[PDB]
Subunit: 334 residues, 5 copies
């Protein structure tokens, strides 16, 4: 109630305070318990091999230099006072661009407790790198991790743990990814040894499964229908050479245009993927259909009966071979 | 009139002032009344699932430490003095990137009143996230919200309300969205409970209806005309096999090119939409027209009368089936 | 000549100076005269509905607290001293992103005069929003404004005027817009009333006329030539069904490809424009040509004379109808 | 050797130093000699009409307030001391975005000399605007300038010169532009008069010649080959109406696709260029070939001899007319 | 254990400390040993001719002014104390945009040792320029270097060396480039002479070999198959003029579309590359096939036997010539 007394207490707490020294400097390591409240996952980029994540990152520790008596209340201070206190050098190992929101003020919270306990909250949007294995794209399953580490202090000076256990990270169920579904999330705590010593490490891992309905409707069905249209030329009478030539070469042209526009629309992934293999298979099928028609046209004059036999064998074989190819493709990747 | 007296009064106000402590610290919560004057909505991005908004955000509260007597005037101070005063830790829950304009100076206003009242104005451009359900795109209706919350202080330390009631937010009628029309806007005040306690919450919601004229003129009419051109082959005499083959396969090629270029131009939305369903329906219709012509050509030699009957039945059926499909599509999504 | 005396004078000027108080605080409003020297207009974006502008913005006012005697010279001070003086809270009403150049130093100039006059110059690159009516695009004429306002001070505390009258803004004739020509520029001074009072307002308006030669050469001529090629099928003998079918459907395909690629290249404007109407007209013309050929082919067997009559009527009508359409289009939009 | 003595000397130099006053304030202007060591030219953008340049910019001047005695050595100080010294208000007239590199520290160098001489070095990446005349693109030759000026000080307070004469700017020969070759570079020194007085001006001009091999291989050869393929129809027998119709209309389609994709790939330049004229000429040639074939087909029945004469005249004329067009094009632009 | 004693020792160390003076100022140069722990290589851009690299950059030196006694421990201080100490002016010669990560705090580490030794660690993401010779693209091998230099201090004031020898740079084996494989990395130490004297220089060079499987599957195979389809017309009977004309011109159209879409997808490299040469060769082959068919069609009437001989010679020659072209191409670039 008396703001002058509270100001005197805070000034006494900050009088002689050395921000350059960690709590219990030269003694036992200071334990920092961390919790994450995930607000959203903005995007998951395959081209950049990363994902954007917005979260409330809260750190919990104890500094006996900040213990105060006579006030039976928790002191929620202005965020600017965080510039006058020691804070852990927590950073994200795999991030590429991170920032703290600063509207209207810096998205930062400092709460002090009578026993010297400090709660330090930040709102962070971080773009964390995620190496994605896109061999099975778009039927792939990815695993993206956020790594939390101390930068300068070793395990002799600081220790990390998930405050609250498996419930340390919340808001995962509220994540709305249009293209992915979060199968599972895991929390890991360990120590990692580098040339400068052992450092604490926390890990938050998500497992994402990609949705396939959009790719099925927009990437596979046109190719299947173009392959069927390529088959259509088999039932066309072989006397109409111009009609069958036009049909085959125009199916080839449609397949080429579809492949090029899909490659333009699909993420710029410079290695072989499942959808690329399927498109190549469809292109090879239409190419073989055109070659078969060419052979039939060439051998028609010498022996029309053999040409008709080849035509009917193509009618009975091409759908069967394509069905076998599709069965192999959809059993290998599923 | 006497600037020395005003300077003395301001120095006395700021002498002993503790920015780390909220007004009435340890007592009743400080009530903050907020008003928004929307200048513009820059863009609404479906790919990024967000919208950019520029506004004048004004906060109104009372700090008895700033009460001054002897000056029967309101003191409009330089914005820099805002760095020497306590301000609410107001932030936007769903924003992704926000900034305060700083040309020529920081777009900030501090006005003091004799009773200790503080008016604090900012000009903020914020990119607020908006989860959009694009199943009915481009006939969709969206609801985008701006959430305002206190970051560190709970409801025991601060309370939010819309100053002016339903007239707290102005400038909505002046918003000029080229692709959307603002059907309605709503103001909500409530409290939200998290693990750290209850926090005040204000919500400003807009309901947007997308315009359809551009999509009708540029996305549906070409598909309808290509479907009609596919129908055209039915009246063409079946003796000209090459002509009908070329017409059908070229209609298929035009449909594929139109679909690919629309997908390139349309926002990168990785799930099924209404326009995708319409394009797939048109593609299926032209595919079925080509298949019907192939069947007629195959059965023409064995029984020309049956081929002619199938041709005339196609003439009478394909427009009817397409009309039924269009009626179902335009009654389901409207 | 004596730098020690000048330093003493400047220190005396800045001794007891209160930056939180405007000149003549509590008295008459301080008049600020503004001049703009436009260096360039970087770009004019229709998609973003804005324009980038680089300028030298100079403010002129009087502060009696800075009046000095004994030095018969104007004091051009280091720009950093601007952080120790009161400056107007001038901002741009319609800007979206503005910055002051800072290489090698902050592009800022402070000049003091013996009578207390202050000249304050900045080099500002501002992206000002401009709502563009693109119904007549690319034959449109736009009007883009830059609005200058005081943020916190009302008309009782500050007044704005164009220093130099109509010659306040210079460098307009030197602006080199590749796609636009500046027809006129205007200067407006007024007062605008908001809920917090009346504020001064300056307005600098440009009228831009878009160049049409690029669009005429690259957007209209291909469509006209494709329409003529569609007409070409009328003179082709109707016995060659395959040739006319191929010509018509390939003209349709070329028109579709041209329209799609123009839409990709043209700015992403989500409403109807003049060029879209012209492209739709050309597409409708080629569609009607193909339909007419189909009708002629259908009725050729029953009555060849009527088919020939329809063919010659098409020959005499289609160019005439297209000429009427072009005349209406080029008289409506010009 | 004695760091305490050096620290005492530096403190004495900075004791009573007024950064707000230029050297020899109120007397003769301070002469600043400038040298540039160009590290690279990152890019030259026609769409943005600018070029990115990284350089070491060194300024040389004399400040008698910094003269020190007793130390027969040059004092290379930490860059942070530059914040405690007067520096020229040097800026780039035509730049759009410039910054000083700040990793690991700010890329800044301060060197003091016993006679008060100051050497001040910065590493600056500046995007300087360059108005490019693209009428002769891609056979164009451009001239891009970097302008250096004092912002606040006139010629009565500061003077600029190129330290070292024509050898002031180095590293030009090491510039590796993939698309341009630096024909020449020039240094200019002058004074420019504005409403606020006369200001010193330095200018560094580069003359760039664009390479043509990529455009010759990828932009002209396909058009020439498509024109030859259009000519091919002349030797095809006129009895095959379908074959010649298909060849002509497909050459037109290929030309349209090539033009559209080149326009997409080429920089977004909204006015007529040489390559656009060449593409239009090729398109007109194929259009005229198709029209000639149509006329031959129309007049074939009435008088086959005249049709054959027109066909052979086309065979002998079209290559000749195209050769004349190419000769005019390659003599006008070379 | 006693934090007050440690604070007293640190204050004594920083009392009288001059950050403007290097260690051993006026004496022997200070030796700085540098180590790099590469975390990742984000991207390698051919269009921008650069590569993004994230690393832990650690500098090791000795400052006798920071030597402390009585504490038999290494002092890991808060990163902010780095603003109160002298640090080397280390910068990257070829970088374009670099930054130090600042979440949650600035990614910076200061460790002091009793003998005055300072370890200074930063986490830096730098976009270093790399001039790439893309004549053999996509079969090219590149060499990208990171150059480390002192900005202001010469070799008389500072010396650089790789601390740990060839093991100074770690984490190279963990680099996961989707499109490149790191063949080798090298460390170089030398001195470079400029007009201002001799400066130390460290160099970290990577040799990258581009993967070819994606280009083989997606860029060469379609062209080869289209060339084979162009050959297909040779076996087609020459009586069907329309069929062969359509096949040849549609193969030309497919080749043009493939080339244009590859150019759109491929990096914007404005000079000749190997893949461009291969595409031009395939286009020339299909063009020659169409020309040969045209010649056969022209000479068929006068002498069918010669036309058949030319057709069979084309059948036996075109695959052979294409095989020779492919052998030359794949032996020249491999
Ligand atoms: C995405 O991919 C990452 C890997 O790249 C996965 O991360 C791994 O997750 C597993 C758990 O699913 C981790 O395994 C566990 O590690 C714990 C930590 O081990 C360290 O610390 C202990 C001391 O506390 C040391 O002894 C040890 O050497 C390590 O230094 C262990 O404590 C766990 O052991 C417990 O469970 C196992 C069974 O799982 C029992 O057998 C044990 O007795 C004990 O009860 C366990 O081994 C693994 O370390 C993680 N790897 C990395 C690199 O972080 C993500 O899980 C994955 N994403 C998803 C969604 O799965
Ligand atoms: C976009 O979508 C959002 C939701 O995602 C919509 O937001 C909802 O808007 C409605 C109003 O249209 C809100 O409903 C109202 O909430 C008020 C607040 O309730 C809180 O506080 C009270 C105490 O003050 C608590 O008791 C309560 O549990 C909550 O914690 C209520 O006060 C309102 O009740 C009043 O009106 C109703 C009728 O509407 C009466 O029955 C009541 O008696 C009373 O008079 C009301 O319930 C809702 O809370 C909002 N949801 C969220 C999540 O914010 C947007 O409206 C939508 N956009 C548009 C344009 O509609
Ligand atoms: C782009 O579009 C904008 C509008 O969106 C145009 O801006 C308008 O420009 C016109 C001038 O061309 C302005 O009209 C003038 O306004 C002056 C200011 O009026 C205010 O202040 C006075 C007191 O000084 C008040 O009485 C008044 O109510 C306003 O608050 C007037 O002083 C002018 O009047 C003078 O000229 C008129 C004739 O034009 C005479 O009849 C009068 O007697 C008097 O001599 C005049 O009315 C208009 O205000 C501007 N509008 C806005 C919103 O700024 C741009 O011009 C346009 N771009 C281009 C290139 O034209
Ligand atoms: C890209 O384009 C720019 C222009 O947009 C070119 O810049 C011009 O470069 C020429 C030189 O090639 C400049 O001409 C020279 O200007 C000097 C400066 O003149 C100013 O200062 C003097 C006093 O010192 C005043 O008298 C004068 O009025 C100016 O204010 C002159 O000193 C030069 O004169 C000398 O050479 C000429 C012959 O060239 C002799 O006749 C004279 O007697 C004397 O010896 C000369 O006139 C020109 O000023 C530049 N223009 C601008 C706007 O900067 C770039 O050169 C071009 N890029 C390339 C690569 O060429
Ligand atoms: C990418 O491309 C760059 C060049 O652009 C390559 O960098 C070169 O790497 C080679 C090593 O592979 C360097 O050659 C070595 O330079 C050392 C430094 O020389 C300087 O300093 C010495 C004094 O210490 C001076 O005498 C000398 O004049 C230089 O100023 C030498 O010490 C090395 O010599 C040793 O090895 C050679 C054999 O290699 C022996 O003959 C010598 O006796 C001695 O033992 C050696 O010459 C070269 O300097 C680098 N060039 C540049 C510009 O940095 C990268 O290697 C390449 N990338 C990859 C992966 O290879
Ligand atoms: C509030 O605390 C101050 C500082 O200790 C003290 O001087 C003052 O008397 C207190 N107020 C009351 C009402 O006791
Ligand atoms: C310059 O001014 C200072 C301060 O007033 C004074 O002490 C000094 O004597 C003056 N110099 C001369 C030459 O008068
Ligand atoms: C170094 O300079 C300081 C300051 O002048 C002085 O006190 C000290 O004695 C000098 N050192 C020596 C060895 O003379
Ligand atoms: C810790 O160091 C301080 C400062 O030297 C000293 O006053 C204090 O007595 C020390 N503590 C102990 C337990 O000796
Ligand atoms: N122009 C004063 C600030 C403002 C405008 N609208 C609302 N607030
Ligand atoms: Cl932000
Ligand atoms: Cl801004
Ligand atoms: Cl800048
Ligand atoms: Cl940088
Ligand atoms: Cl970062």
């Amino acid at each position: 109630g008396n703001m002058s007394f509270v100001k005197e207490t805070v000034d006494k707490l900050l009088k002689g305070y050395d921000i350059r020294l960690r709590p219990d400097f030269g003694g036992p390591p200071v334990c920092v318990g961390m919790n994450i409240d995930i607000a959203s996952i903005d995007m998951v980029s395959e081209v950049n091999m990363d994902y954007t994540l917005t979260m409330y990152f809260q750190q919990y520790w104890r500094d006996k230099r900040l213990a105060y008596s006579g006030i039976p209340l928790n002191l929620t201070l202005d965020n600017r006072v965080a510039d006058q206190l020691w804070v852990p050098d927590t950073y994200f190992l795999n991030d590429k661009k991170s920032f703290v929101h600063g509207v209207t003020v810096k998205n930062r919270m400092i709460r002090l407790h009578p026993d010297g306990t400090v709660l330090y909250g930040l709102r962070i949007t971080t773009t964390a790198a995620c190496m994605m294995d896109l061999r099975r794209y778009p039927l792939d399953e990815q695993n993206c991790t956020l790594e939390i580490e101390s930068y300068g202090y070793t395990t002799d000076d600081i220790e990390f743990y998930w405050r609250g256990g498996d419930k340390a990270v919340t808001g995962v169920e509220r994540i709305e990814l249009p293209q992915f579904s979060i199968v599972e999330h895991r929390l890991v705590s360990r120590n990692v040894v580098f040339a400068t010593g052992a450092y604490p490490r926390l890990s938050l891992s998500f497992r994402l499964k990609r949705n396939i309905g959009y790719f099925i409707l927009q990437t596979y069905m046109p190719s299947i229908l173009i392959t069927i249209l390529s088959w259509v030329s088999f039932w066309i009478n072989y006397d109409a050479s111009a009609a069958r030539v036009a049909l085959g070469i125009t199916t080839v042209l449609t397949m080429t245009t579809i492949n090029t526009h899909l490659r333009e629309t699909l993420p710029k992934i410079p290695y072989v993927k499942a959808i690329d293999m399927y498109l190549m298979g469809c292109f090879v099928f239409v190419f073989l259909a055109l070659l078969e028609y060419a052979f039939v046209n060439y051998i028609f004059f010498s022996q029309p009966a053999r040409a008709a036999a080849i035509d009917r064998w193509s009618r009975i074989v091409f759908p069967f071979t394509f069905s076998l190819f599709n069965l192999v493709y959809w059993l290998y990747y599923v």
